[PDB]
Amino acid sequence: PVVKINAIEVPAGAGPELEKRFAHSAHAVENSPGFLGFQLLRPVKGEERYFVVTHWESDEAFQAWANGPAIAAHAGHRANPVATGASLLEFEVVLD
Amino acid sequence: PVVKINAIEVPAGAGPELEKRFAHSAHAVENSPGFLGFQLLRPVKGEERYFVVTHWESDEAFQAWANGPAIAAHAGHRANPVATGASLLEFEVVLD
Numbered sequence A, B: 001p002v003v004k005i006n007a008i009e010v011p012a013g014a015g016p017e018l019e020k021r022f023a024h025s026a027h028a029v030e031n032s033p034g035f036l037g038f039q040l041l042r043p044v045k046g047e048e049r050y051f052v053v054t055h056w057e058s059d060e061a062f063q064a065w066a067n068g069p070a071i072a073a074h075a076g077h078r079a080n081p082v083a084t085g086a087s088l089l090e091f092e093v094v095l096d
């Protein structure tokens, strides 16, 4: 499988907000094909960015999400966004 | 009216590609409400970024585009993008 990590940047004190958005909004992509579920990681030390860690059977699994329903997902939340940045770190799973 | 300028960053030699996309690939949003048409500016000196200069009757006119049909527009082109960056510079038209 592959892993996509998204380092999301959130101004101070808006992590609860960004958190309520994964909960009280649309945490729904677990029926995307090849999706193996994600973790949302709140930073405590070494870090100030939220990490979204997602596993997938393949990269084509990932691209089905990104290049399909993601471009149009969560329009309102992205029209009024709480995040101020992101980076997509992309890996191959070599051990477990 | 207001003016939104988008400094699009494009790697070397892909300005023709980004140009075919504004021409032969859906240059169409001139019937978006409050839209007053755009110019696409190819840089020659002082600059390496393409500028998209758009005028609008109001910012709400602009937001109708961005927060409406733009989050879902040109999906394929954004799935295979030729640009590597952008910035939204926003102004009020004070003289003309």
Ligand SMILES: C=CC1=C(C)/C(=C/c2[nH]c(/C=C3N=C(/C=C4\NC(=O)C(C)=C4C=C)C(C)=C\3CCC(=O)O)c(CCC(=O)O)c2C)NC1=O
Pocket (backbone or CB within 6 Å): A070, A071, A072, A078, A079, A081, A084, A085, A086, B070, B071, B078, B079, B084, B085, B086
């Ligand atoms: C649709 C999927 C989508 C794609 C393909 C996408 C591409 C994309 N967005 C970026 C930044 C960014 N993109 C946005 C926001 C948006 N960008 C948009 O295309 C839309 C609709 C919004 C909605 C508000 C912001 C706020 C940044 C960073 C700006 C900053 O860091 O200040 C960057 C990199 C900036 C850089 O590296 O120089 C890329 C490649 N962003 C997306 O959300």
Ligand SMILES: C=CC1=C(C)/C(=C/c2[nH]c(/C=C3N=C(/C=C4\NC(=O)C(C)=C4C=C)C(C)=C\3CCC(=O)O)c(CCC(=O)O)c2C)NC1=O
Pocket (backbone or CB within 6 Å): A004, A006, A008, A018, A021, A022, A025, A026, A027, A028, A029, A038, A052, A054, A065, A066, A070, A074, A077, A078, A080, A081, A082, A083, A084, A085, A086, A087, A088
């Ligand atoms: C593929 C892994 C992945 C998944 C499945 C995912 C789901 C997801 N991303 C969210 C926020 C977000 N998601 C992104 C960016 C992205 N979202 C993407 O799917 C991709 C590929 C990017 C860009 C790298 C950003 C910037 C936010 C904060 C949105 C906000 O400000 O409210 C939310 C909260 C709703 C919201 O605020 O809009 C969910 C449920 N995010 C991920 O990163």
Ligand SMILES: C=CC1=C(C)/C(=C/c2[nH]c(/C=C3N=C(/C=C4\NC(=O)C(C)=C4C=C)C(C)=C\3CCC(=O)O)c(CCC(=O)O)c2C)NC1=O
Pocket (backbone or CB within 6 Å): A065, A066, A067, A070, A071, A073, A074, A077, A078, A079, A081, A082, A083, A084, A085, A086, A087, A088, A089
């Ligand atoms: C909320 C859910 C959300 C989703 C699902 C989303 C989709 C999304 N964001 C992307 C890139 C991107 N999107 C952003 C940032 C943003 N994009 C925005 O819509 C906003 C508001 C921001 C800013 C907070 C950045 C910076 C990238 C490029 C990430 C990178 O490659 O480093 C991409 C292209 C990823 C790829 O294939 O490489 C997608 C599909 N953007 C979202 O925000």
Ligand SMILES: C=CC1=C(C)/C(=C/c2[nH]c(/C=C3N=C(/C=C4\NC(=O)C(C)=C4C=C)C(C)=C\3CCC(=O)O)c(CCC(=O)O)c2C)NC1=O
Pocket (backbone or CB within 6 Å): B004, B006, B008, B018, B021, B022, B025, B026, B027, B028, B029, B038, B052, B054, B066, B070, B074, B077, B078, B080, B081, B082, B083, B084, B085, B086, B087, B088
């Ligand atoms: C301001 C009004 C505005 C309009 C009406 C507009 C239209 C427009 N933008 C395009 C490319 C693009 N448009 C953007 C970004 C944006 N597009 C937006 O409407 C906004 C608000 C942003 C972000 C600030 C980028 C990054 C490209 C290059 C896409 C590519 O690499 O193919 C294209 C070419 C098709 C494509 O490549 O997808 C058109 C016709 N661009 C603008 O900037």
Ligand SMILES: C=CC1=C(C)/C(=C/c2[nH]c(/C=C3N=C(/C=C4\NC(=O)C(C)=C4C=C)C(C)=C\3CCC(=O)O)c(CCC(=O)O)c2C)NC1=O
Pocket (backbone or CB within 6 Å): B065, B066, B067, B070, B071, B073, B074, B077, B078, B079, B081, B082, B083, B084, B085, B086, B087, B088, B089
């Ligand atoms: C092609 C047509 C296209 C459209 C119509 C589009 C819409 C779009 N891009 C946006 C931000 C943004 N979009 C990008 C960049 C990208 N976004 C991408 O989809 C890709 C591939 C890149 C990078 C090459 C960036 C960097 C911002 C934030 C610009 C800023 O706020 O200064 C926004 C929010 C603008 C705002 O209200 O602040 C919209 C509506 N993005 C597009 O690319």
